[PDB]
């Protein structure tokens with residue numbers, strides 16, 4: 001029916017507007033303030049920029065492809081589309097992992113923080129997170145490295161989903177999972193678990209000296225957002241090739257849109273959650 | 286213009302040197318070192334060693350420490366105080382021993398009262414609100430040989446300490462003369478009572494018991510500073 | 526005593542301060558207003574100076 | 584005999600206050616209300632000077648009105664070229680606690696002072712390209728607040744010892760020591776005639792000293808806090824004083840009277856620096872509210888507001904020809920505003 005199509009259009013419009021406005025606000029606020037030019041704030045700014053590019057030049061073209069279950073224009077544009085989505089999502093993940101490492105050095109080693117996390121190393125972090133995803137994203141997609149075989153499977157699966165789609169083979173899918181959702185996730189988990197233990201012991205010391213919840217809530221929020229958004233997509237896409245590719249396309253649509261919702265929710269956990277940023281923003285108002 | 290090129294190159298070289306100065310200034314940690322006249326600060330600075338103002342620089346493990354032993358300011362004034370709102374911690378030093386009713390200054394009260402007033406004024410100062418005070422009690426063994434005889438009891442000018450009883454926190458692991466533990470934990474307790482009046486999670490206190498001269502006076506400072514920074518970095522991220 | 530000496534010094538300083546000619550406040554105010562209105566003609570940083578004469582060039 | 588001295592001092596005070604009250608038979612509020620207001624004033628930053636590490640504590644300008652100096656809590660004394668926005672000199676110090684600056688009228692000597700109680704005289708133009716400490720000034724016990732050059736071989740120092748001192752650079756002796764006040768002094772200002780200067784102390788009492796006779800000349804009171812900044816009128820008749828009670832005041836030497844003052848019931852912070860313009864029509868004062876709040880010198884009206892800093896304004900200056908204004912705050916950012 002047309003009612004569900006109109007509802008989908010409205011929901012996707014809301015999502016795209018939300019991500020655009022949030023990322024733009026973060027970019028402009030972090031862009032010009034002398035009181036906040038800390039290198040970690042440069043990392044947050046890079047997060048916001050890559051999310052803004054994802055929201056502007058990738059979202060709207062897949063907005064209608066899933067809406068009508070068909071592709072308007074083929075040729076070579078969808079090639080750069082599927083090579084840009086990979087690059088931008090991977091850059092976002094790498095930026096999250098680097099933020100976790102920076103916070104780990106911020107808490108576990110408190111008095112050698114600024115002799116190690118200077119602007120030189122943060123620039124290296126931004127360069128790596130911008131360069132490593134892009135090289136592979138363009139190489140694999142252009143050099144026909146995504147499937148490396150299973151041509152019949154590729155052709156029948158792509159045609160079913162609307163004309164052009166992301167396809168993964170067995171070895172390629174295994175490498176993708178291991179390299180993109182195993183090191184970042186494990187690094188984030190270990191770092192934030194250690195920080196939770198340290199904060200727990202310090203809160204206990206203060207409480208029984210002057211005679212927990214905040215750390216639980218914050219690490220909850222962060223890990224819940226990241227896992228709820230990305231984990232289903234990667235788990236399903238790594239199990240599917242070993243299950244003879246029996247999966248309706250609607251699941252794939254919803255999984256990609258969960259990744260997009262991660263891109264939308266990202267600048268609220270890391271920039272709209274802390275009092276100093278909201279203080280600066282209200283000082284502007 | 287050759288002249289403008291020379292101007293530009295000179296400015297570039299100035300910036301290049303100032304960058305290295307920036308790195309070196311950012312690496313180190315700066316601590317004020319405020320003390321009393323009777324308390325022995327020269328002994329402590331000499332132990333770390335192995336114009337009215339003096340400076341002593343040292344490194345404990347790998348961090349560079351700058352101790353700003355002030356002796357140049359106008360004592361009965363607070364204008365010089367606001368110059369020190371960015372130090373990591375103040376190493377307050379008052380020695381435990383009081384001799385027998387000895388006043389810090391001619392108009393000031395006895396030592397165990399003038400020191401309390403000094404600590405109160407430093408604690409409640411509005412410019413000093415993000416700096417963790419580190420108490421450092423010295424001349425401890427001299428008090429151990431002072432109250433042991435019992436002639437100069439703490440009751441000479443303190444109406445309490447007769448009803449005082451030692452808390453469970455008292456842990457004299459070497460076990461030497463457990464009678465003096467009551468007195469030392471007493472003086473520690475009135476020093477710690479003041480820190481809870483305005484303590485609102487922004488600045489803490491770290492008492493200590495130091496006897497005469499010892500090398501550990503270095504290491505302790507290290508540890509204290511570390512803890513302070515941790516808490517300062519756990520309030521920015523809503524984890525503590 | 527030292528207090529006697531310093532009090533005598535203060536008294537002598539007060540006596541010297543008292544032995545000073547007095548000038549009416551109206552005359553001083555008139556002179557200040559006259560100087561201000563006489564030099565208000567040039568008054569850079571207040572008058573709308575041309576934008577092509579300030580060497581800041583911004 | 585002490586009681587007799589006290590009573591005679593009180594009688595002298597009563598006599599001088601009665602004489603002061605008798606003379607104060609007029610005011611300028613009505614006549615300054617008669618004159619036309621200047622109107623709306625707005626200025627915008629033109630250049631921005633940056634490169635310091637910690638909060639800037641002082642700033643002074645040279646007679647060429649092109650280059651200037653700045654002192655940082657780090658221990659750096661940097662000589663700027665404001666027109667081209669460049670650094671021409673950079674000088675490291677031994678004492679990291681410096682809160683003074685000065686620039687010689689001859690254009691080749693610079694001074695600095697602070698907690699160390701020693702004022703260092705530097706030779707800018709030597710045979711060798713580098714700049715070296717020409718001499719050092721000992722003697723003061725309290726911290727140095729500010730230092731000004733009377734000439735190429737004289738200097739005036741104000742210290743935390745409730746006592747100020749002239750110094751001959753060549754012989755290095757505390758010649759012509761002015762003793763007075765109860766609380767420490769923190770501000771100074773010379774005169775164009777180069778014969779008198781005023782000093783302010785925290786006891787809310789400013790003293791006008793004559794250098795030649797070497798003793799106190801005039802006294803002015805009227806504030807309820809410490810004196811934080813002082814400036815002297817281009818005409819040489821008046822001066823402006825700024826305290827921590829959110830009140831600027833203007834006094835006149837000839838009348839020896841507390842003249843008209845300023846107040847706005849929206850500010851509670853204390854003033855830190857005060858300075859006039861070329862013609863003296865408008866007065867720029869820096870507050871702790873992170874801005875320079877400029878007043879009209881005669882109407883006492885808020886005519887213009889200058890924001891753009893995000894920390895305490897600790898020093899501001901106006902070049903001799905009233906050409907421009909510089910302001911340096913605790914964010915380590917000198918900015919030229921016009």
Ligand SMILES: CCc1[nH]nc(C(=O)Nc2ccc([C@H]3CNCCO3)cc2)c1C
Pocket residue numbers: 085086089090132133136166176179180256259
């Ligand atoms: C840099 C190493 C690397 N090497 N390979 C990958 C990779 O495949 N990452 C990746 C990330 C996101 C997607 C989703 C996101 N939006 C829906 C469709 O695509 C797909 C693949 C990485 C990272």
